[PDB]
Design a protein around this ligand. Sequence first.
Ligand SMILES: *Cc1cc2c(cc1C)nc1c(=O)[nH]c(=O)nc-1n2C[C@H](O)[C@H](O)[C@H](O)COP(=O)(O)OP(=O)(O)OC[C@H]1O[C@@H](n2cnc3c(N)ncnc32)[C@H](O)[C@@H]1O
Ligand SMILES: *Cc1cc2c(cc1C)nc1c(=O)[nH]c(=O)nc-1n2C[C@H](O)[C@H](O)[C@H](O)COP(=O)(O)OP(=O)(O)OC[C@H]1O[C@@H](n2cnc3c(N)ncnc32)[C@H](O)[C@@H]1O
Ligand SMILES: C(=C\c1ccccc1)/CCc1ccccc1
Ligand SMILES: C(=C\c1ccccc1)/CCc1ccccc1
Lengths: 494, 499
Amino acid sequence: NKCDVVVVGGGISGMAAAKLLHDSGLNVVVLEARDRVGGRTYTLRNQKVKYVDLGGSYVGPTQNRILRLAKELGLETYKVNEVERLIHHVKGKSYPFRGPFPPVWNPITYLDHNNFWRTMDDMGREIPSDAPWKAPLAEEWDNMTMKELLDKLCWTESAKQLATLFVNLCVTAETHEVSALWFLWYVKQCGGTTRIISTTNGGQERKFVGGSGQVSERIMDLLGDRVKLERPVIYIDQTRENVLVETLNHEMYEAKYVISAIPPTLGMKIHFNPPLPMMRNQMITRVPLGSVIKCIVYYKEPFWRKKDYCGTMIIDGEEAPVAYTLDDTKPEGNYAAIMGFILAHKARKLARLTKEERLKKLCELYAKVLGSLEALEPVHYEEKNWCEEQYSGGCYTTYFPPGILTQYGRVLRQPVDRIYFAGTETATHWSGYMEGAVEAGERAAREILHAMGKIPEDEIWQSEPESVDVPAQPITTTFLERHLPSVPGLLRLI
Amino acid sequence: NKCDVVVVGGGISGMAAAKLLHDSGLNVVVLEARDRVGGRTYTLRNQKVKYVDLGGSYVGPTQNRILRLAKELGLETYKVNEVERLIHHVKGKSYPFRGPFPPVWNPITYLDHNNFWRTMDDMGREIPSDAPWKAPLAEEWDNMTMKELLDKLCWTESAKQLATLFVNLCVTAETHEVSALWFLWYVKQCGGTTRIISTTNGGQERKFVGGSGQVSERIMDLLGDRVKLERPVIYIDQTRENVLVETLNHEMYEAKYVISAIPPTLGMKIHFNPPLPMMRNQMITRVPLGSVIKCIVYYKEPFWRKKDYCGTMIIDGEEAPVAYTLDDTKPEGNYAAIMGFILAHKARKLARLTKEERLKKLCELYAKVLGSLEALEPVHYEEKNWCEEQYSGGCYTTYFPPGILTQYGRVLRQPVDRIYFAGTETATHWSGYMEGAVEAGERAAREILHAMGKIPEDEIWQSEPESVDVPAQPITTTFLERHLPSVPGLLRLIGLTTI
Ligand SMILES: *Cc1cc2c(cc1C)nc1c(=O)[nH]c(=O)nc-1n2C[C@H](O)[C@H](O)[C@H](O)COP(=O)(O)OP(=O)(O)OC[C@H]1O[C@@H](n2cnc3c(N)ncnc32)[C@H](O)[C@@H]1O
Ligand SMILES: *Cc1cc2c(cc1C)nc1c(=O)[nH]c(=O)nc-1n2C[C@H](O)[C@H](O)[C@H](O)COP(=O)(O)OP(=O)(O)OC[C@H]1O[C@@H](n2cnc3c(N)ncnc32)[C@H](O)[C@@H]1O
Ligand SMILES: C(=C\c1ccccc1)/CCc1ccccc1
Ligand SMILES: C(=C\c1ccccc1)/CCc1ccccc1
């Protein structure tokens, strides 16, 4: 029954909020729909894999909140393998390379590629992290899909192909499905293109030893009986003095404040009394999550390393089921594995096949890309289709279709009476990531602390000290990168 | 507890399904979330208005299912007033006209306007009503917004402006919000541009005497205690032999089959066991409803008629709160009124104002458009913002953003075990309308009858005899309308001569 705060959702965001409030002296309850915590993170353990992240996994520099929370819980990171060469596979052929960006030799194509990445960041600089709808050209950019933007910007098919893959991989959605404004905000709020795409010195630098699921599990250990599993919330009543929260099994919870720490659209699963304000009522029908299958193929050995390949493959083309891979071998060098993503429309298309059929296609692809018959001999396979999850709705995160961010965006974290809003979608830095989940949960918790008169308004938004374990190198450009003309710019010079 | 079929939702679709099943001998229960039936139709009665439709209202020729159902329930229609001139208001000036389409005098603009409407119908002919994702260019058209299509097709601002208003009015959404494929399907499945936009001989020809809400109310009367009000469904369990359906107040209902007769996205309000198939699970998060406020301003007299205006206004421009009106006077000539829609982004924008502030802006607009000070003297005002409805989600209906119809479209009315799907969104003819609600409800009901071995597969989809009361005149084109070139077509005819 009674407590100070009910938190709806036991993912990283809900757990972080609950930890903060509990450490501040309040009585908190976490209501979780599944028989487990973690949400969009899930670590599977069995003898064949030891442990594997089937959901959220990667952390890197500038993600200081998730790193500090994990460190406090007694967790360690290790570096994703990027010692050897990356592979760009394009039109049925593999081109090994070094550095974050796949290189280009044709001069016209070079200019086009250079201008695309640069323009993404140029446009991002006009978009406020905490208020993307306040961009000077917000409406113009929001009334346009990323497909339209790419059609105008890319003068070569080569740049357009890579840009499309870039969009598919970042947000598990097609270019024609997403707002240009929203996608430009999304990249900007992760620190730009270099930071978002990079393993070394970027978002995919590291994973947690033992899996990311330990973050939520260990916070549950700290909270003891305060976490209630298999308690899907169905009903929130705010008509009386105290907020009443009902779960599917008929249990009642009474609190002064609620934190909603679920994906925005999953708010639809709750019946509200009184009805939600009009803008939120419509917003939560307008914000889907992307489509992805995460697949891990295991091998006797990390054989790609012998050929001077790190395990990273960037794979172009409709025929390829997987567009991107990383080495998923344990830091000890055992349980050799390749992690790959099946993205967007391919996730919908290939879901019809059996587990075995998907494994076959992946192995045959990897054999082609790595130029190795050894890829045809998997020892084990694990996979997760996130599209099928009732209490996630997809992965990695929520995308905004054209028109929505300007019309409904300011409503996302606006409190509804005594309901405050967490969840990675409401963060201002690395929204969509585990880092954003921590930012949003702790911020929502502090909003309630302020409403209780426990802290000054000053302290709702708090900066984070840089991790000593994962220091950030700054993102640099060269003189030529900054000043080389676009394709149309070169044509004007002619 | 126990019955043959549980119907979720007591709108026109749910009520039509329940009536059919009940008339066939089965024991049916209707579970309705609100304290009333009707859903997106709602008739308000008070002394000032007598009665008024605050939601769905208009019916017309080719809508034979809603007309037959209403007639069986003892209802009558009357004709919306279109005796006098329509008004097209553009750039702060009114131009009176007759006929369905606002006329154009500039020859270049004429070609552009003619080609736009023609192309909409041309493209529609390639789109199967029952399977829009099967169109030859389905993917190309679906990966494009209506805004992109309009930018390529309209060579004049005048055509683009009117086309934009056309999209806003048909589907209560912005051109940049909606898939081109989906919108083209939507128009086609209503019988084309002429049929969808027309009062006389089209969708807006008639209303029901006493209001459309009587349709659902009278079916409830026929069903008696079988309709359960204030029973929002929260949980559907299909793991056991019989389907278990739970409501918010903890009541349990057990049935052989369920009809879901709610807007697709509102399926999100229900927790499923076992979980929904993956494609439906994602589909119901991808399909929002549009935004609209329906507003009715009352006057002492239908004064616009004296100036030879019927009361129809097509109003262009960002500054205008209302883009479309119709005369809403009773057939007796009393309770003189103007009905207007506040559409899409304007519904969101002007919702912040008070009721009084909205009334003021409408009167001042009407005064300008009708050139009449009398418009500044309203005697009464009613309005409904459908965006604020938890158990509707918006109005009139569900739109599909770019990319969705081809990826998830075939899932819309695909049964999930013993759950079958009604609701106007699943219809193949006048989806989005009361007609589509009747088609979908009765078809879903017959799907269950077939599964029970009561009828042949042959009989699931049934044609409807034409109404004798509301006959349909065919849609005709002229020779010039068919063969006049587009703007780019004329330019090609010029480039050819210059050689
Ligand atoms: C799925 C995915 C995500 C992902 C990723 C790869 C995949 C396949 N890669 C990542 C990466 O490597 N690095 C990274 O930082 N993140 C990446 N992600 C995304 C990341 O996992 C998410 O951003 C993050 O986990 C989101 O956390 P958040 O706490 O904000 O949201 P959640 O995990 O979805 O938690 C919500 C919980 O609420 C429960 N729920 C839902 N509805 C109810 C109701 N009605 N009542 C009670 N509880 C409810 C859910 O069950 C869930 O536990
Ligand atoms: C809103 C609107 C609609 C409209 C219109 C103008 C406005 C402002 N103009 C129309 C026009 O003049 N001509 C016409 O034919 N229709 C036009 N419309 C659209 C029309 O009203 C709709 O197409 C039609 O009414 C839809 O009927 P349907 O039966 O398919 O759907 P519904 O009316 O929304 O009914 C759904 C019912 O289900 C209940 N509900 C929702 N969730 C639950 C749960 N979880 N449990 C139990 N019941 C639930 C709703 O309360 C509703 O009653
Ligand atoms: C993008 C890599 C890239 C590099 C070059 C060209 C195109 C793409 C990584 C983005 C990512 C990876 C994994 C989870 C989230 C985001
Ligand atoms: C469109 C009229 C029109 C006529 C000419 C130009 C542009 C628009 C009517 C559509 C409509 C009206 C009422 C509810 C549903 C649909």
